[PDB]
Amino acid sequence: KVFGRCELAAAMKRHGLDNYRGYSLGNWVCAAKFESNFNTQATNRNTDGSTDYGILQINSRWWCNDGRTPGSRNLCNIPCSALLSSDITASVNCAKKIVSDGNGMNAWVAWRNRCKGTDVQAWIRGCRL
Ligand SMILES: [Cl-]
Ligand SMILES: [Cl-]
Ligand code: NA
Ligand code: NA
Fold this sequence. Notes:
By secondary structure, the chain is mainly α. The protein has 4 helices and 3 strands, in the order H-H-E-E-E-H-H. It has one domain: Lysozyme.
């Protein structure tokens, strides 16, 4: 599913991301925009052979099992395919573990390069949340 901006902001808020670990909702929506263009089915292969999955491009090296990333872990204890669902629950729950891991939203390189230090409230402006 390809979400609209406000639609995703609302779903993220319902699923508990608003100010989670201090990150306002606009940070999460901005990250999703540049990671996946709001498309739950987005996948992208990494140079190391791992793959990124779903609206927040969660990586198989650490976070989910895809059966083809040698030597990886599955810290969210889910198949990576669960991260492609129209239901964003698995992605949000796994994202909460990632953002708690020590480096905050810097785990998402696109957030660091394109969202960090910007007016992220713009991403939720006009939304009935
Ligand atoms: Cl990407
Ligand atoms: Cl694997
Ligand atoms: Na393997
Ligand atoms: Na932080």
